[PDB]
Amino acid sequence: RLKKRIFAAVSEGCVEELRELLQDLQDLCRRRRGLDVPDFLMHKLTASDTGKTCLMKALLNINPNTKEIVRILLAFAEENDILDRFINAEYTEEAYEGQTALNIAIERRQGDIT
């Protein structure tokens, strides 16, 4: 009930809804036993059926406030130190295998987010 709300707030442009859900991700991992915290937080942002992350979902759905949404997601992945695995993720299905977030940002003609 947490993962489905993050993908919904990102696709529609909800700024304050998205930021409230990110503090609950820190609070849910804090009470965790804590073995593979950088591995645990990745499968809470990656759809296990397709491989799509939440940064890919923001760039496919261009909003009038999508430039500030990307800044919030990068500052979250910087604090918990999975910024390399978050910005370099790939699809796993055969139809889109190898597509990253930079292929999506160039195709939407975004000169600033690139």
Partner: peptide, 12 residues
């Protein structure tokens, strides 16, 4: 142009 007003996100 940049693309909005599509029915489906995944193109294939």
């Amino acid at each position: 142009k940049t693309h909005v007003s599509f029915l489906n996100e995944d193109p294939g």
